[PDB]
Amino acid sequence: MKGFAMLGINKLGWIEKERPVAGSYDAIVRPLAVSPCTSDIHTVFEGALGDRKNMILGHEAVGEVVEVGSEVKDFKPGDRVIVPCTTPDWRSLEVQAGFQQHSNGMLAGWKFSNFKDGVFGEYFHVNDADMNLAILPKDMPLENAVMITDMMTTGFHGAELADIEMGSSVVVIGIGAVGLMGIAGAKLRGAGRIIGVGSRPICVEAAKFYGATDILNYKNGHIEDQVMKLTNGKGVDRVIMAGGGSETLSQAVKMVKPGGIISNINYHGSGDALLIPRVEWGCGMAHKTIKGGLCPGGRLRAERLRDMVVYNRVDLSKLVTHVYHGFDHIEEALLLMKDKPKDLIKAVVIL
Amino acid sequence: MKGFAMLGINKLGWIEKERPVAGSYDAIVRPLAVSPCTSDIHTVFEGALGDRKNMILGHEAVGEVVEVGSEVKDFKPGDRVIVPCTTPDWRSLEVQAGFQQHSNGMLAGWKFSNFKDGVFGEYFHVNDADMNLAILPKDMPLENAVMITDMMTTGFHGAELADIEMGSSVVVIGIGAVGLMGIAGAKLRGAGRIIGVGSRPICVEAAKFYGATDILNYKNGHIEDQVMKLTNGKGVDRVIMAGGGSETLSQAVKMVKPGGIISNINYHGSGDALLIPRVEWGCGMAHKTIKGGLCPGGRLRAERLRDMVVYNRVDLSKLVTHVYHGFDHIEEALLLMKDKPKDLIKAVVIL
Amino acid sequence: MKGFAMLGINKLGWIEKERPVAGSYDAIVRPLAVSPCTSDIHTVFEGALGDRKNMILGHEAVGEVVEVGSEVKDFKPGDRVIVPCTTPDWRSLEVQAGFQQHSNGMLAGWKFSNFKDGVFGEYFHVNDADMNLAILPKDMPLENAVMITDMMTTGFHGAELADIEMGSSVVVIGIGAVGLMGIAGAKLRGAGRIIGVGSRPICVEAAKFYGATDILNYKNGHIEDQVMKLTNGKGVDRVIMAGGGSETLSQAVKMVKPGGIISNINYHGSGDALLIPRVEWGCGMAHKTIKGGLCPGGRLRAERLRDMVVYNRVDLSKLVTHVYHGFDHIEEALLLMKDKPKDLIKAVVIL
Amino acid sequence: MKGFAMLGINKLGWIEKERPVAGSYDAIVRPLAVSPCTSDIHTVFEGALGDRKNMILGHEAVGEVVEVGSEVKDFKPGDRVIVPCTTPDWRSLEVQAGFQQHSNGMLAGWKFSNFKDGVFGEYFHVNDADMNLAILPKDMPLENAVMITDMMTTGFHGAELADIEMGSSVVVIGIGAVGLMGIAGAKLRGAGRIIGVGSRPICVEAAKFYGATDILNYKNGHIEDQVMKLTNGKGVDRVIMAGGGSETLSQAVKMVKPGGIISNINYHGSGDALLIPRVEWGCGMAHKTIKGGLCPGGRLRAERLRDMVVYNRVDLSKLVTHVYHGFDHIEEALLLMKDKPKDLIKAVVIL
Ligand SMILES: [Zn+2]
Ligand SMILES: [Zn+2]
Ligand SMILES: [Zn+2]
Ligand SMILES: [Zn+2]
């Protein structure tokens, strides 16, 4: 089969690969719709996850089941399914410890395009079908459903890790697709004021659409200062880091209140470390908690998020600015996440 | 001064009481708008809190500060304020333990109409003005603001105690004002499916408006059985008990999943005890957690909820079905909470 | 293969059954040491598990693996293992939802002598060996190791569910083996005062050994009243229900502080329900949380507790008062759990 | 009155100030025994707090109440009390928010020798006596009681923040008094393996006494590498930062498992910032939570820890290696926390 893979760090292209075979508990799926992620640009042109060779990219897709193992009971050929980007090995001590995202290793719950051939191929492999797939509702637009697989689960996890309280004030740094879902998630956790930080006009409008009450541009003065001004020097209760460089950690620390929580869902693919300003972190005694985690995956998570969409808790259509028809457009679509044009949030390639 | 008080069990009427005086940290406030509560009914016509004599009723009001103690720094005469029904004594070991609602005693955080003269008087006393009051926004309708003091904080507390997860399935038993805010709060905590239980026409519509995806009526078969069918034998993740008799606990236990949480915010006014069905509670080993708590109060809570209304996170106007002008209407309004006409949800008396 | 089973109601006796075969991920184990449980006595002499046709009893044992399925990778014949009484199916949505104990059904994580032959047989079946077994340390006395499989995990789970704080006052109702581990677990969560409730001398001394600072005899006065006397009418922070009748719930609600937590680890098998005293439960608004759950099982749980024993965090030898050397002494021991002498806590048969 | 104070940054000496006067809710206390803390050495010869003008030092004391305001109800002249180093303003929004330690400002809950005159004076002021004092048991040794005020509450808070689970593996970096309490606290939260890092012989022996199962000398090599060796490359579940410089944060991240928690109670008064290693922090998605907070204070905390000592949950006598007798020794004592000989842990000057 054919697949669009990374031909080593800093290089990519279409390659020929043997079609994967399903294990007793797995399923082979052919994509019906896929989307490129900024994370795949970190992995390729930054090698933030180490080197790789001939690894088919992509981890955001909805498709049709073509083959299932002899032990698969809840899925069969013909089923259209939503595939979370995180497909953990449920039989691991990490799962028993409460962290499905790290089953058998740090980040190992996320396989597709991490270390396992991705969804940008005529067919792809899903480990443990019954535990990692969810049925795609018949009336659900493909482009919308693809947003559940990574953007929605990641942005919401940002809101979940933030442990938001009814009326909490929240700052979401970065209003790209992940940041927009962080805003939506924060609103769906009861947040009062929500301050989104970004400049790309299209993202600014979506930010407000999802719940932002204030929008700040990281080019009108240090974001910390702006936030303090807006909050009368009181700061905010929570900060979700969803975009920008590692310096955003310091900014988050300076703008969050003592006792607050900073939740990172931004995949930092460059630099040796992230700095915590000593003074503003109360010399390590300000109870300014810092969290950061990979998005949850698996069937339960996908079914729960899917159902929220079906119940109109969030409108994912606003995330998709670019829709293409035809496998060949995957190359160009991915390159958009690298060049990032002004009118782009997320792109979906419908096969 | 005059006030509408409980002349004793089953007796209501206007009486004279000395005008309250503020201590160093207190404030004397005159009501601008008030609302009667079903709780006032449990206390009077059922002595749910024990015998009382000439206690002014009511605990839901927005008003104007007339006098403040010498140590009050953040409030002054003339200030328009939102008064949370729960006004805790912040200097207590219970607060130090994390439960403001029980400062100096079980339910002692709630004073108005519990054991302290209520807001149905020409003037009422608010302990610790700086810690228990919030400014009423200049553009906020008085009837809407009154809904923050009890209905919103209570219903939302139901959702908070329910520890809702993104996409959780939730059943709210009872769709009166409190149940409606429970539905709104559940959606604002990320709930997917929300099943409201009620039949009153106006309440049914408000419930769907606040987030209910399904509506069930008792007069159509045992509620627990109906829910089991709807969830195809699986049950729901969470249950918020907002209204009805004590037998609703058994209903909640039967419809909730193992590991689920039952959140009670219903003020049970009669009966010796509440029953838990042994079998369905997994003989006490099914991790079906049961919570039950008094709504939070105090300045922080009121300001956070106030701000949620300002940022249109919830529309409180749908709760007020009846509006009266004139202090004297308090009697008629309070009686409606007793009669419960099918077109009533909440009534507000604007002085 | 022979094994002491429940012939029928009030009927016990050895029987002949075919040796269970292992599935690809299972392991067959032969007992090295086992222990009768109060739950064994109730399933038979009380039909607390309906009617079972020739079901081999027992669910507390440590042993030697004799066979493993083709897909088992961490265990092999000859391995000595600790077998947690709860061996759930790790591939289920309940597990993805955070409740291993109820995987594929309420209390379904508990299989041995529930709907699967128990450990009182020459050989027994363990589902998913890699996820549900833990190696038995070389120099760990067998009697102590068996106490891990249920007494330790259950008692400690009572302390875990109680969400004990440093210096918290705790009451453990019932000082049988489970209550003793509840006492030890509470001390291991930092409890200050620990009040044990029971009457048998052997248990009273053991309770003090594990951490009890006060002892109350339930036969000499209403327990809630005695607790109020010990606490100057203030009540306690937490209550762990580990014994006695279901009225113990009412007693627990009456002695616990508002905002407190009641943790049930006792199997309630009589009557149609448990009662919550309305008044003392603050009419359902006292924030007196009620929890109850089957002990966690699985490999991680077993290795973690095992290591606590290895690092001498708890001395389990005090739980074993009767040690038999012989495979046939199983019937004697089980009946020894029925007639329950005053000098018995737990009996261990080292075959 | 006299006393030892911080006559500016880097300059010490006894100054003459007007004996403090108690307000309506305050109390004046005469020290019976006090102890110097490394924390003051910082504020002084490091200016980690900024600049201070004539601030009496010391915040670890047990004393006699000699004067109370007209509103104090639970304490009176003659009472012997335990004074927590942290004495919050319970009437603040931060308290309403759940953070007593930062009432009215970051770290503002901590007054003595922060911005308020300390206890190294003939008499000191205690804000809100009823809310911030605890009775000293008559049998409890003075030197032991002093250890409660800061060392115990801080070390235990380190264990609390770490959210330790039964059987968790824990590493405590630094074994000075605070770290020793962190070890004792970790053990009292159910920890299995506890690895202590330090070299002072007296501290190492105290580490083992309080629960340490392994001891590591950071001078031997990168502690993260030593820890990985000890745990066969698996890392540990939790880390408590109680000593060393800001680089210990990186070491903590490198030795803790994904999903683990890092708890800082170490007061970092030097350097621009602490670094988080990008790769080992899973690029910010490894769920390696980082917390850090000032110790809790107030009456409830003091009474709970006091009771733990009374019930022998922890033996504080091991922390006191130096005992003097004379208010004039205070000066000498504090100097020990500066040079710090290898046979000293904490010093107590009895008056
Ligand atoms: Zn992605
Ligand atoms: Zn009310
Ligand atoms: Zn058992
Ligand atoms: Zn200190």
From Swiss-Prot, chains A, B, C, D:
InterPro entries: ADH-like_C, ADH-like_N, ADH_Zn_CS, GroES-like_sf, NAD(P)-bd_dom_sf, PKS_ER. It comes from Clostridium beijerinckii (Clostridium MP). Keywords: Metal-binding, NADP, Oxidoreductase, Zinc. The gene is adh. Homotetramer. Belongs to the zinc-containing alcohol dehydrogenase family. One of its GO terms (molecular function) is isopropanol dehydrogenase (NADP+) activity. Alcohol dehydrogenase with a preference for medium chain secondary alcohols, such as 2-butanol and isopropanol. Has very low activity with primary alcohols, such as ethanol. Under physiological conditions, the enzyme reduces aldehydes and 2-ketones to produce secondary alcohols. Is active with acetaldehyde and propionaldehyde. PANTHER family: NADP-DEPENDENT ISOPROPANOL DEHYDROGENASE, ZINC-TYPE ALCOHOL DEHYDROGENASE-LIKE. Transmembrane segments: none annotated. Its EC number is 1.1.1.80. This is NADP-dependent isopropanol dehydrogenase. It is an enzyme of class 1 (oxidoreductase). It catalyses: propan-2-ol + NADP(+) = acetone + NADPH + H(+). Optimum pH is 8. Its cofactor is Zn(2+). NADP(+) binds at residues 175-178, 198-200, 218, 265-267, 340. Binds 1 zinc ion per subunit. Zn(2+) binds at residues 37, 59-60, 150. Pfam families: ADH_N (PF08240), ADH_zinc_N (PF00107).
